[model samples]
Every structure is written in C-alpha cells, then in structure tokens.
Target chain A: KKSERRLAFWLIAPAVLLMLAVTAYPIGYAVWLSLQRYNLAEPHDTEFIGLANYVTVLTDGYWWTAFAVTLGITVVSVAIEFALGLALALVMHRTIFGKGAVRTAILIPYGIVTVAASYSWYYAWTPGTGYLANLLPEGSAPLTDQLPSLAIVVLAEVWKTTPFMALLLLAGLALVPQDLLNAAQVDGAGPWKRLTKVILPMIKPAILVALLFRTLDAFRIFDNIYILTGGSNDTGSVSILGYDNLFKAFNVGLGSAISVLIFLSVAIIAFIYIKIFGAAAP
Target chain B: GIVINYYTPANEEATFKAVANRCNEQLGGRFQIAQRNLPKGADDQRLQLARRLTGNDKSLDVMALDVVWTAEFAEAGWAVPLSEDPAGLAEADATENTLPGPLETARWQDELYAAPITTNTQLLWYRADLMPAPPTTWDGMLDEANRLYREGGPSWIAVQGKQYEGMVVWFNTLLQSAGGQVLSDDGQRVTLTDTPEHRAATVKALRIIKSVATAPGADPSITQTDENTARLALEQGKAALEVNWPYVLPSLLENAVKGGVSFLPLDGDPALQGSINDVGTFSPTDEQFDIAFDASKKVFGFAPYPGVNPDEPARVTLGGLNLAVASTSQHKAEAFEAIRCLRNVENQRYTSIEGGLPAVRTSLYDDPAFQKKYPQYEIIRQQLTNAAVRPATPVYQAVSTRMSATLAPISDIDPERTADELTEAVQKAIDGKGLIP
Candidate 1:
C-alpha cells in the first residue's frame, strides 16, 4: 500500500505543480499586490497598506456596474449560445445534403481571430462604410448608444463562440443511439420526447462541459468589449474594467484586487455547477 | 558594436527607416540600432509601454515617448533622468533654442527626462474655393462650418468625437485657448473647478461641438467618428472644416484627390497661402486620383484651430514624439548618442518634409528649399513656440482617461450635467481617487 501511494504521488506530482502554479502563484501574488499601494506610474510611492486597495474597489460604482454587466452578459450569452448550439448541432447531424457546407460555415467563426472579426463587425455596423449601416436608418449609430452597443457586443460574442458550442454538442449528439430513437418512435415518444428523455439524459456531461466553458468565457469578456464600445456607454464588462485599472490607470494594487475578486466569483460559479448540477448526471 | 532597440510608431516606419539607414552608415558599426514599431494609436502605445516598463523589461533601450507620458515615465524611473549621460551628449541647451512649447513636454519638475525630437500643432483645414480664407474666432469658424455645409460640402466639421484620449486634447486646447488651465500652474491641484474661466472654457467647447453637430448637413454618426474618419469625411466631401494635424496635408496629397489643398501659415507671414495642385485636373482619366476635375471645386484649407476670442493667440497642444533612453538599458550612453544622431539636422528635415512632423527648432524653416516644400512651415514653427503642453503630472493618463469618458460619444453630451461631472471627474483623478463615476 505504501509503495502504491508513493508511485501515484510521483505520477501526479508534475500536474499538481502545474495546477498550483496556475492558480496558487497568481492568486498569492495578487493578494500580496492588493495589500500594497503599487501604482505602476508612481512606483516610488509603493507601500503596503493592508486591504485599502480592496476597500477602494468595493466602494467604486464602476465595480458594481461592471459586476452587473458581467453577470448579465454571461447569463444572456450562454443561454442564447446553448439553444443555438444545440439547434445547429441537430441540423448538422440530421442533414443529408449540404452537410459539408454547413460544417464548414460553422467552423469559420471559431477559426477567425477575435480582433480581426471585431474589426469586420465594427466596419460592418459602422455608418458610411458598414454594409449593415446601409440597412440601418440614416443617423442611427448602433455602436454609440449604450443599449444598442451592448446588443452588438452580445451579438458579436454569440456569433463567434456559438460554433464552438455546436462542435461540442455535436460530439455529444454522436453518442445518442439510433436504436433508442427508433424504439422511442415506435412507442409514440415524439421527437421532442425522445430529445428530452432519451437524448438529453445521455449527453448531460457534454451539456455541462459546454455550459461551463461558455459561462466562464462570457464572464471574462474583454476583446469584444475593448473594440466594440471601448467599454464606453456603460457596456464595460468586469474584464474591461480590470484592464482599465491595470493598463490605463497603471494601478496595479487596485487592478489586482479586482482580479482577485473576479477569480473568486468565477470559482464560486464553477463550484456551484460542479457540486450541484454536474455530478451523477447521465 | 552595441545593440540598441528603439521603439517608435508603426506609421512612421518609412521615415525612421530612412533616418536609421543614414545614422547607421554614419556610426560605422559603433552601434547597431533596431527599429521596433509600437502600435498605431496613442492609447494603445501608452498602455503597451506602461505594461512593459512596469515589469522592468531591460531590452527597451530607447523609447519614442508621447508628449503627455514624460511626467509618468520620468516619475516611475522608467525614463532615465537626462541631466547628464556617460557620453556627455545631454546638455542644458543642446539644440539651438529648442521651441519652448515642444520643450515643455520633455520636462518634469524642472528636469529633462527626454529629448524633444518632433513637435506638432493643428491647422484649421477648410474648403478653400468654397471659402477662400480661414476664420479667426470661434463664432466665425462655426458660421463658416455652417455656411460651407449649406453650400454642399461633406458636413459642418469632421473631428474626433469617439471615446478616447483625442477628445481630451480637443477639450484641453479649447480650455487653454479660452484662457483656462486643466491643472494649476504648480501641477499640484485641479484648477478645472472653482473657476469661472474654466467653466466658460468648457461651456464654449461644448457649444462649438453642439453647434457644428446640429448643423443642416451634420452626420449623425459624428459621435462615433475619430480623426481618421473625420479626415475621410473631409476628403470625401462630407465635411467642410477641421482643426486637425499635419497628417491631413500628406493624406490629402497622397490621395491625389482633385480638390485643392490650401495652407494659411503664420499670423503675419505676409504670403502664407499655398495650394497643392489638384493633380486630377491635369489627368482626369488617371486612376491614381479618385476624382474628375470639377473646376468650381471646394478645396481643403488649413489654418489655426480658432481661439475663444479673435484677438488672443489660439491654443493647440504641442503634439509629437520625444526620444527617451530607458533606465533599464545597459547601453544608456550609446542610446543617448543614437538619439543625438536621430535628431541631426538632416533627419529632422526629412521628418518635417516627408513624415509631416513639425521641426522642433526655428532655424529649420530658414531654408528656402524647406520653406518651398511646406508653405505651412512658418505657422508650425510659430505655433510650436506657444502650443499648450498637457498638464505636467505623472497621473496625466488618469486625468485624460477620466475626462475622455466624461465627454465621450459627443451626441450624448448634456449641457446641464457635463461641467459639474467633468469638474468632479478631473478633481477626483488629480486626488488619485480614480474617477469615482
């Protein structure tokens, strides 16, 4: 038993170290930074004053607004992606003709660079130059207003990542047995029933994986927001807010505090999903 | 030979390449200078440099410092304190009477941290044939914008209004031109609030934007427009007037666009006006210029961005890049020497003519050949002597970012709420409270 334990320990040691460095190193360093008043632009004044930076972030209205924006975007985007991903997965699976074309189309969005796609979408919606601008009534700047800009951001996010979601769901869709579907059909278990009872039950893990992957990605949205409204018009996500603090203000201490808080929120989300919904499914 | 990495703008690659090739030949293997291009926009470069320097990257030998960044970089000790160097090249009055407006950008706390390589100021680019001369006052410019718009120009004006640092520059120039300051003379407290002059300045700037914005031919997407977009709007016959930089002249000429480009140089240079011949007129069939000669064409015009009162000297930010040796570099002396080489009269002259950057010294304009190339050279030289330097503070980025946010998407700007909000925002940034809103 002792020999087995030692062998197992050595086998997992490398991964454990990598995992610890992944979270432990950053979180520990961030905690240390949060305790210090380290403005990158004013380094001579760097001083450790415990929890002051954290307090400052907590009291900021931008912090709460960012938090709300993060949650709103995450929930809305993930829900939309899941529905569309599953639908696309079904279409791709059941299609007899043009399957190759459908698959190729779905793959393109995932392959395009986020920054490149962002510019494409920006120009597409921009007045005078954008094709979509022609569709819009004259004088309408969808990107300049708050709600419209947020809508565009969400559209861009969903458009880019939905293909990724569909690919995952398609893998799960492959696992559903044809025999079970035939049996359900014979027993008057309609297509919806077969989907709910037979197909969904078997692919619960894949669904969980997709949801977990997308929710986290949506929560940490940065590039799209960075380009679209530039985090202007009250459309800034938490990541954009963190970036502004760190890069724009060069306030490392406050930025780290925000980073720590974001990690905590994300961890809490993961904990809820895994502990409550993920276990013992299918 | 020593390795020195110099970071500069991506668009200025051609100019720098020319400068470096000459300098390298002159140095003759003493130092091998490499050109590493920074991102295009000012905001992107500022963020990139801040991130790198914060981590103490040692490879950054010489950096192209933005005018507003000197205070921050110097305070952070990222930029070497340049009172002296190992080569003894850094001197008190190194260049012959460097223009004060541009020179102010290099100083932090009465100490030089960088060398002013190039300086810039905006000229009021307008429709020349449509309106032959430039307006001298705020109201006159506004009326001109409307008149030109009414007579079938692109629109009233094409200026940067997007959510970024440029708007703050636009606002700051106006504030200073209106005889107010963003920060106090001591560079300590926020002077934007608690002063009627400051309020008046802000009010007048907001009014000008609003007036032009609501004009008959105004583009509703003006809120989303930036300098590039504004420039395009001008070239495409969408807007009539602009208070933009020297880049417009080059871009217009390069476009080979048929419309005439006119420049009104210094206030009293008796013969200041000159025109870039609309190349399209000579060859209407040429694909190079996207134009058919309209003899009654309304050509682009350039002058100073109008000041609040007609009698006062108009204010514009002394914009441009400065060269600073990084504190982390091992080759500080070599880097300083390289900077001196970069600032040689020959390359500075090239930058002025080819790169469209204004020369830092007055003597450069004395050359008849140089004068003949850029008729606006005298105006730029004169403007450089008195252009407004952004508030000398290490926290200028914070001030700029907050103020930009407060005034962004100009279409959304409210007359009642803007002054109070901006005043509070600027004050908060100065206090290091970090723009509460």
Candidate 2:
C-alpha cells in the first residue's frame, strides 16, 4: 500500500508539471501583467500599477458589447450544434450506406480553414458575383448589418464544427450497447422512451464533452466575424479586443487583464456544467 | 550559415521570396534567409510583427513594415536604429535618392529607422470616353459624375470607402488637399486647424459620397457589404472616373481599356498642386488640354486627384512598404546586408511590376526596360517628390483604426447630418484618447 501510494504521486507528477508550465504559468504571468502598467506603444511609461489595468478593462463599454455578442453566439450555436450533432451521431451509428465515405463527406465543412470559410461566405453573400445572392434581394449586405452578421457567424460556427460534436456523441453511442437496446424493446419500450431511458443514460460523458467543447469554442469566436466584418461597427469579440490592445493599441497591461477576465468567464462556464449538470449528468 | 527570418506580405510573396533568394545569393551563400509569409494586408503584418517584437522574439530578423509604422515601431523600440549600421553604410546612401514623401515615412526622431523600398498612392482614373478631360477638383468630379448619372450612362463613383485601412488613407488625402491637416507637424496631438478651409473639406468629404450614391443608376453593388463598388467600375462597368491605386485588378483594367486608358488620376501629395507641376510624377502629360475632346471621343489620360477647387490638384496620401531590422534580432548586421541586396534596382523593379507596388527611386522611372512595361513611371516619378506622409506617431494605429470608422461609405454616413460627431471622434483619437470610449 505504501509503495502504491508513492507510485500514484509519481504517475501524476509529470502531467501536473506540464499543466503548470503550459497553463498555470501563463495565468500567473497574466495576473502579474494585469497588476502592472505595460503599454506596448508607450513602453517608457510602464510601471507597477496594481488594479489599474483591471479597472481600465472592466470599465470599458465595448467590453460589455463583446460579452453580449459572445454570450449570444455561444448559447445559440451550442444549442443548435447539440441538436444537430445528436442527429448526425444517430445517422452515423445506424447507417449502412458506406460508413467511411459518409463520414468523410460529412466532415468537409470541418476540414476547410476557418478564415477561408468566412471569406467564402462573405463574398458569397455579396450581391453582385455571389451565387448565394440569387436567393437575396438585388442589393443586400449580409456581413455589414449587425443582426445578419451575428446570424452568419453563428451559422459558420454551427456548420463547421457540428461534425466534431457528432463524432464525440457517436463515440458515446457505441457504448450504449445493442443488448441493452434490444432488451428495452423486448420490455415494450417505444423508440423515444428507449432513447431517453437507455441511450441518453449511457452516453452522459459524451454529451457533456460535446457541449463543453463547443460552448468554449463558440464563445471565443473571432475568425468568422473578423474576416467578414473586421470587428467594426460594434461587433468585435473579447478575443478581437484583446488582439487590438496587445497588437493594435500596444497595451499589454490592458490586454492581459481582459485575457484573465476571459479565462475566468470560461472557467465559470466549465464549473456550471460540472456542478449543475453533474447532479444527474446522465 | 546564419539564418535570417524575414516576415513578408502574402500578396507580394513571390516578389519578396525572389528578393530574399536574390539577397541570400548576393551575400555569398554565408547567409540563409527564411521567408515568413504574413497576411495579405499591411495591418496584419503590423500586428504579427508587433506581437513578435513585444515578447522579445529574436526570430524576427527583418520586417516589412507599412509606411505608417515608422513612427510607432521606432517609438516602441520594435525597430532598431539603422544609422548605426555597421554592415551597409554605403548602401544606406543609395536610399538617399528615394522620393521625399516615402523617404520621410521611414524616419522617427530625425533619423531613418527603415529603408523605403517601394512607394504607392491612389490615382484618379476616369473614362476618357465619357468626359472632355480629367477633373482637377472634387466639385468638377461630382458635377461630371452627376451629369453622367442624369444621362443614364454608367453613373457611379468608386472610392475605397470601407471602414478599414484604405479609408483612412482616403480621408487623410482629402483633408490635406482641401488645405487642412489631420495632425500637426510634430505628429502628436490634434492639429485639425481651427480654420474654415478644413470644415468645408470635412463637409465635402461626406457630401461627395452621398451625392455619388444618390445619382441615378448608382450601383447596388456599392454599399451594405455588397463591396467592390470602386473596382467594379473599373472591371465591368462604364463608370467615368475612379480614385484608386494604379496596379489594382490590372488584368481586369487591361481588358476594360481596349483603346488604352489615356488618363490616370493619382494621389501624389497635397502641396503638389500649384508648385509641384515641374517636380515629381505628374508632370501633367502633354497637359491633356480640354481643346480636343467633343465628349463623344474617348481619350485616356492621367491627372492629379481633384481638390476642393475644380481647378486645383488634390493630394496623394503616402503608402507602400518599408524594411527595418527588428529590435529583437540577433543578426542585425546580416539583416541590413540582406536589405541592401533587396534594395537593388532590378529587385525594386520586380516589386514594381510583379508586386503592383510603385518603385521608390526616381531613377527607376528612367530605366527604359522598366518604362516599357509601365509608362506610368513618368506619373509615379512626379507624385513621389511631393508626396505627403501620414502622421508619424506611436498612437497612429489607435488614431487611424478608430478614425477610419468615421469615413465609412456614404450610404452609412449622413455626411451633412453627422459632421460634428465624425470630426469630434477623429480629433479625440489624434489627441491620444483611449479605446474605452
């Protein structure tokens, strides 16, 4: 028992150390940065200014615009992705039509570069040369309008990444067991009941993984909106704002504070899933 | 062999790679240069390099910077001092002949921080078939555009009016042409003069945009993200005049001009109007006098972008890329050496024709071989001598980025309606305001 306890510590140490180096270290550094006055453009003016960076980042009004946009995109896209991923997972699990071909075909959207996809869609909605323009009015700007731009960003995310969620769910479906399904049918359960009571219960981990994976990704959405609209006209996300601060505004102190805030927001998301969803995860 | 990592732009990848390879070879194979392809846009390259240099990443040996970056990069210590270069003192002298406008953009604190390799500015290109001659002022251009619209002819105006980098250049040019200034000579604080000449320029900037859109048969492809209203005019339509860079959609323009485009409207520099006629690129080719045209005949010609007065030549906003040694680089000497090789005439010509950027040197315009391919060299030579550089400062990005929104396309701007708000925003930005508001 004493030897096994020592062995457990050694086994976890490497993973723990790696995480500390990659994740914990940056967070610690970011916290330090947030406490300082580090302007990339005004480098000579840098000094230790505790809480000043945080105050600047928090009080900025655009930060809230970004928060609302991110939250709206995340919630809507995750919801759509879960429903669609669930359907795709079922089809993949039950289909007999050349599994390998179907799987590859469905992953096409996921395979294209995000910026390329955004560009394609941006031009496609263009009224002149765009084939998608065939569906719209003679002159309509999808990427320029805030509401349409939001819908397009969500559509791009849902289209490109729903496959990953489906694949994750499919992996969970494999663990659902044919015997259990058959046994449930024998007991006179309908298709809906069987799925709810049997299949859903069996794949709790998969559901959580898919939802969390997608929620975090959609929350930090940048490429689609950035390429399409350049985060102008009040549409930038927190990541885009962070990019402007560190690179454009040349202010690392403010950028690091926003980054730390973004981390806290995401952590809160993960925590909600574990605590609230965990009570009866399956 | 020592390796030099050069971060270059994507659109000019081939030209940059060729320059890199040529430089590497010229250095006698002791140096190996690796090209890191940056985004097609200058802003992106600015960002990518800004991040690299901020973290003290020594991998960025040489950087291809925008003309606007000379102030910020040097101020922030992202670029190294070139006057102390031990590698190419004589080669630096060769750059002394670069046009005044572009050459000035690479200077910070009274010393050069980078090498001006190529220069660029937008020209006013009009349909020679539609008008008697090129309009020399903004009022003339609009009246002509409006007249054409009334005739059910290709009635449109093409300017890069999007809320991006180009729009800022567009605004700065107009502001200067109308006898106004965006920033003071010191490159700090708001210097929009308290005079009347500028307020008219500000109001007119918005007015021209709205007027063009209101013209009959105005292209629906113009605004609300349909995009390409300007280039579209050059490509497939019969629109009369467009204010844009020369080498844009060249193949498309080549086809559009079957009888050959006789006139080209370019943005050289502001003061080039009255005194600069004999000096730089515009030498007003044969003066394209209005004597010959009957409005039915097509005559392709080039003129200075129109100013507030229909008779006065407008300004050219300074553009194009400069080369600098990254401050974090360990191989500064070799990097400057590589830069000297890249600055050669043949290499610059390649960047000119192949990359669509104009040559930085006046001597290149005389290179018969270069002139044969692009006779526009005569025009480029005239513009550079008096070209006006953007405000040089560390806060330029904040100023330009925020202020660009004020210049959004006419459809989005109620010019006469929101004059006060737009002017106030840019003034605030130039005065070193934060992004929070």
Candidate 3:
C-alpha cells in the first residue's frame, strides 16, 4: 500500500510541476504585479503600492459598468444556451433519419474559429453592405446601440457555443438505457413524465457538468464583443476592459489587478455550480 | 558582416522585401539587412517592439515607427537619435526636403530620432453627383449631408468613429481644426483645459463631433466604423461624403472602372498603386485606367478636411511610418546607413508609387512622374502642409486610450460637460493614475 502511494506520487509529480509552472506561476506573478505601480510606458515610476491598483479599478465607474455587463452577458447567454442546447440534444438523440448530417450541421458553428465567425457576424450586421443590416429598419444600426449591441454579442456567443453545450448533453442523452425508458412507459408514465422523473435524474450529472463548463466559459467572454462592437456603445465585457488596459494602454499593474478580479469571479462561479448544485467533481 | 534585423509592419511584403534587397545590395556586404514583419496594428507593433526594447534585446536593429511613436520610443531610450554618427543625417541635410508635419513627428525633445519614410493626411471625399461643392466647414458639411438626407439622396457621412486609434485621429483633427491642442506645445503638460480659451475649443470640438454623430445623414454604424469601413461606405454608394486618407482615391477608381474588378495587377504612381493594392485590383492596361480615371473624377470630388471655423483651414491629422535605429543595436552606424538607403528619394518614390504609401520628401511633390500618377497630388500636398499630429508624450498611448474611450459613440457626448470630463481624464492619464479603460 505504501509502495502504491509512492508510485502515485511519482506519477503525478510531473503534472503537479507542470501545473505550477504553466498556471500557478503566471497567476501568482499577476497577483504580485497587481500590488504594484507598473506602467509599461513609465516604467521609471514603478513602485510598491499595496492594494492601490485594486482600489483604482473597483472605484472606477467604467470597471463596474463592465463588470455588470459581463455578468449580464454570462447569465443571459448561458441560460439561453442551456435551453437551446437541451432541445438540440433531444432532437439529435431521437431523430431517426439523417442523424449524422444533423449532428454535423448543428456543430458547424462550434467548428468555425470564434473570431472568424464573429467577423462574419459583424459584416452581416453592418449597415448598407450587410444583408442582415438591410433587414433592419432604415437608419437604425443595431450594433451601434447599447442594448442592441449587447443582444448581438449575446447572440454571437449563443450561436458559437450552444453546439458545445448540446454536444455535451447529447453524450448524457445517449447514456440513458432504453430498457429503463420502456419500464417507465410501462409504469404508465407519459413521455414528459418519464423524462422529468427518470431520464433527468439519471442524466443529472451530465446536466451539472454542461452547466458548470458553460457557466465558467461564458463568464470570460471576449472575442465576440471585440469583433462586433469593439467594446464601444457600453457593450464592453470585463475581458475587453482588461485587454484595453493591458494591451492598448500597456498598464501592467492595473491590468494585472483586473486579471486577478476576473480570476476570483470565475472561481466563485465555479464554486457555486459545484458546491451549491452538488455537481460531480471533475 | 553585421546583420541588421529590420522590423516593420507586415504589409506589401514583396515590395518591402525588394526595398530591403536594394538597400542590402548597396551596402556591399558590410551589413546584411534582414527583414522581420511585425503585426499590422500600430499598437501591436509597438507592443512587440517595446517588449523587446525594454528587455534590452539586441536582436532587432532597425524598426519602422508610427509617426507618434518617436516620443515614447525615444524617451524610453529604445531608439537612437539619428544625429548620432556614421549616418549623421542631421549633418547631411537629409530631412531638409521633408514635409514639416512628418518631420515634426520624427523629433522628441528637439532631437531627431527617426527618419520620415512616408506621410499621410485625410481629405474630404464627396460625390460630385450629390453636391455642387464640398463644404469647407464641419457645420456646413453636416448641413449639406442633412439636406441631402431630407431630399432622399445617398447622404450618409462616413468617418472613423470606432473606439481605437482612428477615433483619436478624427478627434485630434477636429480639436486642432478648432484651434485647440490636447497637450501643450512643449509636450510637458495637459492643455485641453489650461485656460478658458482652450476649454472653449475643446467644447467646440465636442459639439462638432456630436453634431455629426447625431446628424440625420450619419451612418447608422458610425460608432463602429473605421477607415476601411468609411472607405467601403463611400465606394458602395451609401455615403455621399467620407473623411479618409488618399488611399481611397485609387480604391474609388478601382471600384468604378473595368466592371469593378475585385483584384487587379497594379501599375500606377507609387502612392496610387499602394492605394489600389490596399483596396481592389487595377487589372486593365494603362489606357483603360485613364478612361476609368476620367469616369471616377466625374463622379467624385476631393477637398481639404473640413475646418470647425470658417476662416482657417482644418489642421488634418497626419499619419505615416518612420525609420528609427534601436538604441540596443550592436551596430548603430550600419543600422543608420540602412535607414538612409531605405528612405533615400529614389526608394521613397519607389515605395510611394509601388506600395501606395505617400512620400515624406517635399521634392517628391514636384516630380512629374509622381505628380502625373496621383491625380489628387496637389490637394494631398496642400493638406500635408497644414497637418496636425497627435500629442507627443511618453504616455501618449494611455492618453489616447482614455480620450478615445471617453469621446466615442459621439452621441454619448454632452458637449457642455465633455470638455471638463475630458480634461480630468487626460490629466489622470498624463499623471499615470487610474486604469485606462
């Protein structure tokens, strides 16, 4: 038993070290950077100022606006994706003809690169040149308005990621035993009742897994909003804001502070899904 | 032999490679010029180069600098002043014929750090079919656009309004046109609200921008539009007026001529060729190009960028690239020599005609070969004479980000309060306080 434990430690050592190097080290470095004043343009002014960067970001109105927008996008997109994804999974699972074709067609959005797909969406929604824009009432550009731009961003997110969610749920749908469904039907339960009572209970872990994965993924949204509205018209996500600071303005300290905050927010979201929902731990 | 790694934007690759080869051949094996193409975006180029420069990496020797990067790079000690020996550009009167606008961008603290390669400025492009004459002032232009809109014409006014460097460029043009400056002439402090006069100019600039955005003829996608989109809006016949660089001229011609060929084998004046390459192709023979050029002229008209005040010409914002030697270079002299060869009059004219980039040399304006090719040369030269540049500061990137963020979506601007808000934001950026976004 002791030898087995030692072997396990030896086997896992590389992975632990890799994780520490690849993930922990950068995150730790970012946390340390967040505690300082480190502007790339004015590196001469670098100094230790504990928690000052955090105060600046938290106190800024733009930061909070971005935070709220990001939260709203996450919640709205994930909810829509989950509902649509489940419907798609059910159709794929039960469809008799052209199952392979439907699966492939449904997963096309997932196969396209996110940025490339978003660019197509951007062009489609542009006024005058885009076919989609022609459908809009004259003189109204949906991508330029606040709520409408956010809606488009959400739409892009849903279109791009719903496939992944559906693919995950379809895996669970395939796992449901036909014998049990027959038995539930024999017990006088209708399709709806059988699904709610038996099928759902059996696939509870898959639902939790899909929701957990998507909730975390949706919270860190960036590319869609970036290509569609470029974070203008009050449609910026927290990730977009972070990009503006770290890349556009080259403010390492303040940007690192934002990175840490985003990390914490994603962690809390994952925590709520796992601990509150009793999700089977990955 | 010394190897001089030349870092530049990844554009017109074959043309740049040709230029590099020409320079290398002239150097006679003393130095081998190697090419490294950086990302296209100015911000990305700066980020890539700055990271290496900050690390004191000696791998890169020569860099293509955006006009506004001189202050940041020079102040960071990442670029070597061109006055340094081996090339002795200052002593050689190399920049004597350089346009004042581009030359200004190549200096920091009154020291020349970069050699001006190409320069650019915006002109008001209007459809002759829509109006008798292009308006001379922003208010007049908007009145024309709105009137056309009311009359059911293609009346959209296309511009760069996206939340990026292009927005800042548009803002600076308007602000400077209204006799306001973002920074003091000395580049030492914020001047946007240093006095009541400056504040009024700021407000006037904001009012002008807000009016355009709120105008009936404004593109529905104005807030998301960039230079390319503005160009497309005009070429697609949706916008009656557009504010964009000279590159739009060849594109307009290309879209109008020879069944609107999407791509063509390019041959024209260097600047015009550059423009064609940037947009669609110019596939037809020279005979067909002339026939198409005439058709293009009949439909389109060019004018100086609109001023805020009626009396003064607009101080259009200038853009272009410059060549700077890395201070971390192991062979500064060779790098400088390569820059001289790279930017010589012959090469500048070559890049301008072949690559669609505009030349910085004032003498290039008088060259018949150059003048005959770009039909809009006179207007371009005149506009370049009165051009303004973005604020020169080590913290310009931060300042630009803050300003662009605050001013964009132009409808969100409250002209009455925006100036004060802008002043505060710019002050914070200059002081290096607060987050950028």
| Collision pairs in model 3 | B264-B281, B269-B353, B270-B352, B270-B353, B270-B354, B271-B352, B274-B355, B274-B356
lDDT of 2 at B199: 68
Task: Estimate, for each residue in B328-398, the C-alpha lDDT of model 3 and write its tens digit.
Answer: 87768777778878887787766665456788788888988778666677887887767887878877887
For A184-263, candidate 1 gives per-residue lDDT tens digits of 89999999999997789888888898899899999999999887677776678898888878777767888888989999
Query: What's the ranking of the predictions by lDDT, best on top?
Result: 3, 1, 2
Question: In angstroms, how far off is B218's CA in candidate 1?
Answer: 1.9
> What does the lDDT read for residue A203 in candidate 2?
81
Docking tier of model 3: it is: medium
The TM-score of predicted model 2 comes to 0.81
Residue A282 displacement (Å), model 1 = 8.0
Of candidate 2 chain B, the 10-residue stretch with the lowest lDDT total is: B283-292
Model 2, B349-408: lDDT tens digits are: 767654557877777777776675564566666666566678787767777776665555
In order, what fnat does every candidate score? 0.47, 0.31, 0.62
lDDT of 2 at B309: 60
Q: Model 2, A1-282: lDDT tens per residue?
A: 889999999999999999889999999999998887677656667689868677767776768888888899899999999999889888878898888888887788878888887788777776666688667874364456678778877877888888888888888788766889899999989799898877897788778877888898888888887887777667787788877777766667888898999999999998988888872343
